[PDB]
């Protein structure tokens, strides 16, 4: 069961409304392991607040170490199901362009080899 499945559409909209009042300079981001991804570990939490000045390069780095990944274990962040955002892009811009209808910004993480394997 994903985050969207355990909580209705109305609950998530309200949830976004409230947390944005509390943190006007943070982006609410839902970060989950991609369903086909078995090699990379799971995170302990699903819901994150990222400071809105952060770029994608910095967010990947934060997720890397929070995942305790080794030198050469690559992972890709797919945003809003369909997008691979250039690393320099600020997340505030990614929020405004890629946020879900419910007001969350959704991401899944997977190795390139996992995304490759699934496309093939």
């Amino acid at each position: 069961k994903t985050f969207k499945q355990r909580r209705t559409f109305e609950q998530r909209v309200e949830d976004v409304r409230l947390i944005r009042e509390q943190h006007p300079t943070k982006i609410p981001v839902i970060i989950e392991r991609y369903k086909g991804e078995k090699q990379l570990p799971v995170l302990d939490k699903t819901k994150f607040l990222v400071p809105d000045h952060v770029n994608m390069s910095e967010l990947i780095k934060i997720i890397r170490r929070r995942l305790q990944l080794n030198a050469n274990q690559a992972f890709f962040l797919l945003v809003n199901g369909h997008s691979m955002v250039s690393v320099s892009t600020p997340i505030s811009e990614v929020y405004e362009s890629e946020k879900d209808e419910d007001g969350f910004l959704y991401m899944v993480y997977a190795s390139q080899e996992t995304f490759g394997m699934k496309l093939s």
Partner: peptide
């Protein structure tokens, strides 16, 4: 249920 702040 709580959020986690991801700072650098």
């Amino acid at each position: 249920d709580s959020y986690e702040v991801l700072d650098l």
